[PDB]
């Protein structure tokens, strides 16, 4: 077991500099403070000499504010000097109440330190492929090369020849400043069609379904999880994946702690402790935690078959409708009453690839969705009595004939799940029917991934459906690829084939550049374009570390992440906060928004020199000298209620910030929006929510049924609580890599014994799409035939065995993956030290 042997940390002095910090990582956006002080100063154990006003010579008790773990401490550069830094959860933040997850609590030790030797992988300099390997260079040189190859290729073959992969998310590697800077370059200065997002291979919404219905996916607050009668959690592992939303808001509800606040805020109806339905084919540590805090009686784990959520939801919708367990006044006042004709190709296909589901009235949707309890039981493999009880827990009125309050939460079990558009619709039907949108204790929401920080010019040019960018690249199309803050090599679908072809195409450009004179730039440029014209690809990577796809790239530009810059984003509550810079960018790294502006300025110069002043003029408006310039040009001018939000005002409001959209500014307070759709007016032209006529049609993505039928195991996939995303920071963090040097694949002990497998063994998962490796982790709670592999992991990429299969809107159907498992080798010696016990807490 990895031990730091740090016996003692520096005490934060009374006069330490305080910085408001939102967590770098997940949607929850837990509040923190960064305290910095000079390297040659320290705090005293007496109250007058430390930041807490507490005597630290005495043991502190459970939930103390006057403590921090080693991972919360580092030494970092600030205004070009080494300072102590502690990055501590804010006890006074309403989100976390001073909770920090295993991830956010290591912001400090996953920071860059020369003095303590943390994250020396961090990029410091521009790198260019020349002289037969990657070589550090100047910004001026690197940007000039990128612009000369980009300008030539789009001038010669059109903007369609420029391919872009980029973050669209908030927090570190995203945020309002960085989405605006990249958005303005590719959508204002240019009209880039062939752009994909960090987690999906086209420029699409995860949730067109809810949005087409007029229900924005983040419509509630975190309090509603405290105030619900029932929580319906669909394809979320919230304890691992939305940790402090679960711990600080769901738990109090399930335990009754919430009952006092319920009665104060909603007298005039009955309130028992919250119950929870969990729709997930796999028994998680989330199912366990719920049982253990509210008792098995109050928890309905619906262990559906993989990708059958839509059948379950249509049956709940049918049953609830037939009983009249619906908010009649809500339906009549706030939803579309006008009948509309089914598309010709219904129910197999929508009116088009663009519109796979039919929007309609309550009554048309019910008859469309219509499914018997018996049939859903067949499809889901649930028992009738589970589905009926789930209906009662959602629908059946409370004593005085009062409406049951239900918060509906979903994430990637649904979104990366079967028939994204229809499943998303079928779940919204339930929340709409029961008037659980825009009321206390309600909502039908994404539980989220990253924080949100999206502001970009119009993407109208991109189309719907948008270009399947990975298929363009695999098919030998495009000339230049700009990659910002994502790593397809670890996280895209059909990743094995993506890598096979991506390597061949970038290799063609590499061989050309190794063979050509660099010091004569024009000859270097012409050798690149000639190689592109033979089917090569010139690749530029904008990142903070050397990525896996970066091993195929010709130019690397080093980015500064949150904390090295000011960054604004909002949580799964729309809670907007300013992360205040507390440290310096490593080496010459610069914020993504300022890289975009610099590339824009270089595009302007190169295009002027090539003698196209008209195209060059499109790349004006990029004179930003700091991330705040990007905030003011982007969020301030373009966000709904942006005119009320500045850094100064956001700073004054601390880690609680304010809920978007902002309605006004009154004496040092931005006024916000606690809940969306409180007036029952939805995000549509006429203000009515639409229901969705969303009939079950099996596994809708091409080749999925075939893959299920022709392979022995389900390769379910997703997150570990310890690992953040593709382990870009974690891979140089001994604590995480000590726990999982290989990605685990959760396997039933009986399944392992039948396959000659023991704990720790290295196994090849293989199928039609490709092959990959993982370490077998014996999991008693796992159903036979059903495995779970950690995703996006550098030492074994699950994406290699996910097919190219998407829905009609190019949403990647990652979760419905089947393959075979054979042994590669016996447990490597480096797994011998691993615990193989249950992740499930025992009372």
């Amino acid at each position: 077991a990895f031990k730091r042997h740090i016996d003692r940390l520096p005490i934060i002095p009374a006069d330490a500099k305080k910085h408001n910090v939102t967590c770098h990582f997940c949607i929850v956006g837990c509040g923190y403070h960064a305290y910095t002080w000079p390297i040659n100063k320290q705090g005293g154990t007496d109250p007058q000499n430390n930041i807490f006003g507490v005597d630290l010579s005495e043991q502190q008790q459970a939930e103390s504010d006057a403590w921090y773990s080693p991972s919360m401490y580092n030494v970092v550069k600030q205004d070009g000097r080494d300072v102590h830094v502690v990055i501590k959860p804010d006890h006074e933040c309403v989100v976390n109440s001073g909770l920090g997850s295993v991830r956010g609590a290591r912001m400090a030790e996953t920071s860059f330190s020369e003095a303590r030797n943390t994250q020396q992988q961090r990029l410091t300099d521009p790198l260019v492929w020349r002289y037969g390997q990657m070589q550090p260079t100047s910004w001026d040189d690197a940007l000039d090369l990128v612009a000369r190859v980009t300008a030539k290729i789009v001038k010669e073959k059109g903007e369609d020849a420029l391919i872009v992969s980029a973050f669209d998310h908030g927090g570190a590697g995203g945020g309002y400043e960085n989405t605006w800077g990249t958005g303005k370059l590719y959508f204002e200065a240019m009209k880039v069609k062939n752009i994909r997002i960090h987690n999906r291979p086209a420029y699409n919404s995860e949730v067109h379904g809810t949005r087409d219905m007029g229900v924005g996916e983040l419509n509630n607050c975190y309090e509603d999880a405290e105030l619900a009668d029932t929580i319906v959690a669909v394809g979320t592992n919230a304890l691992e994946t939305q940790t402090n939303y679960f711990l600080n808001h769901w738990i109090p509800n399930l335990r009754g702690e919430s009952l006092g606040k319920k009665k104060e805020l909603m007298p005039e109806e009955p309130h028992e402790a919250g119950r929870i339905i969990i729709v997930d084919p796999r028994r998680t540590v989330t199912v366990n935690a719920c049982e253990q805090t509210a008792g098995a009686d109050n928890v309905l784990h619906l262990a559906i078959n993989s990708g059958t959520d839509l059948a379950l939801f249509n049956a709940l919708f049918t049953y609830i409708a037939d009983k009249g367990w619906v908010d009649r006044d809500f339906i009549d006042k706030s939803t579309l009453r006008e009948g509309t004709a089914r598309p010709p190709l219904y129910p197999a296909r929508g009116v088009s690839e663009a519109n796979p589901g039919h929007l309609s009235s309550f009554e048309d949707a019910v008859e469309g969705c219509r499914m018997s309890i018996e049939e859903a039981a067949e499809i889901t493999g649930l028992d009738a009595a589970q589905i009926i009880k789930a209906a009662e827990w959602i629908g059946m009125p409370k004593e005085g004939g009062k409406r049951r309050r239900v918060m509906f939460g979903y994430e990637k079990g649904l979104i990366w799940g079967n028939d994204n558009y229809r499943t998303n619709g079928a779940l919204v039907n339930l929340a709409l029917a029961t008037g659980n949108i825009g009321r206390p204790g309600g909502g039908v929401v994404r539980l989220g991934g990253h924080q949100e920080g999206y502001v970009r010019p119009s993407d109208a040019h991109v189309g719907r459906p948008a270009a399947y960018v990975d298929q363009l690249l695999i098919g030998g199309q495009g000339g230049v690829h700009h990659i910002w803050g994502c790593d397809h090599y670890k996280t895209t679908l059909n990743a094995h084939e993506f890598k096979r072809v991506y390597k061949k195409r970038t290799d063609m450009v590499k061989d050309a550049m190794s063979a050509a004179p660099y010091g004569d730039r024009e000859a270097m440029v012409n050798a690149i374009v000639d190689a592109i014209n033979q089917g090569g690809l010139f690749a530029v990577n904008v990142d903070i570390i050397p990525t896996k796809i970066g091993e195929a790239c010709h130019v690397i530009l080093p980015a500064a992440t949150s904390g090295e810059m000011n960054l604004t984003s909002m949580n799964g509550e729309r809670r907007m906060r300013l992360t205040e810079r507390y440290m310096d960018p490593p080496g010459q790294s610069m914020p993504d928004c300022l890289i975009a502006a610099r590339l824009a300025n270089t595009m302007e110069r190169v295009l002027t020199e090539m003698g196209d002043v008209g195209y060059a003029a499109q790349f004006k408006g990029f004179d930003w000298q700091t991330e705040e310039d990007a905030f003011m040009d982007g969020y301030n001018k373009n966000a709904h209620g942006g005119e009320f939000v500045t850094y100064e005002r956001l700073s004054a409001m601390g880690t609680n910030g304010f809920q978007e959209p902002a309605t006004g500014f009154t004496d040092g307070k931005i006024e916000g929006t606690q809940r969306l759709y409180t007036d029952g007016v939805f995000s549509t032209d006429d203000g009515k929510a639409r229901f969705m006529d969303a009939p079950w049609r099996g596994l809708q993505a091409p080749g999925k049924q075939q893959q299920k039928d022709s392979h022995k195991y389900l390769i379910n996939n997703g997150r570990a609580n310890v690992v953040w995303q593709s382990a870009y920071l974690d891979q140089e963090n001994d604590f995480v890599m000590d726990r999982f040097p290989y990605p685990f694949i959760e396997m039933n002990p009986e399944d392992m014994a039948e396959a000659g497998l023991k704990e720790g063994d290295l196994v090849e998962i293989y199928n039609d799409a490709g092959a990959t490796q993982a370490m077998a982790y014996p999991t008693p709670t796992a159903r036979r035939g059903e495995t779970f592999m950690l995703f996006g992991f550098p030492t074994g990429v699950q994406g290699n065995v996910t097919s190219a299969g998407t829905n009609e809107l190019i949403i990647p159907n990652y979760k419905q993956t089947w393959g075979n498992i054979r042994k590669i080798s016996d447990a490597p010696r480096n797994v011998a030290h691993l615990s193989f016990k249950s992740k499930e807490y025992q009372s």
Binding site: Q61, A62, E63, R255, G256, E257, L259, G260, A273, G295, S843
Partner: protein
């Protein structure tokens, strides 16, 4: 003295609430207490060894309570309150003077 029972209660507050609003947590609310029955509080899930020791008939008199806050574990073998239990018997007496309010 109940003043320096509040200081000793810092070791309970994580699992136990007392005063206006006090709700069940990892442990049951501890309002009143002196005059309440074992396995008493409504809502809380007591262990098959804390239910078994209500069956026979008990109360939280100050002598039964001193034995618990000193060695909870083997004194009521199978109790969900695993925890060393206050070793100084004058602190057992301070925190119960705090419990005397509420």
């Amino acid at each position: 003295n109940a003043e320096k029972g509040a200081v000793v209660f810092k070791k309970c507050a994580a699992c136990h609430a007392v005063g206006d609003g006090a709700a069940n947590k990892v442990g049951p609310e501890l309002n009143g207490l002196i005059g309440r029955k074992v396995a008493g509080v409504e809502g809380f899930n007591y262990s098959p060894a804390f239910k078994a020791k209500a069956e026979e008939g008990w109360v939280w008199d100050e002598v039964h309570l001193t034995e618990y806050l000193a060695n909870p574990k083997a004194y009521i073998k199978g109790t969900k309150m695993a925890f060393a239990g206050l070793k100084k018997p004058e602190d057992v007496a301070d925190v119960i003077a705090y419990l005397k309010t509420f």
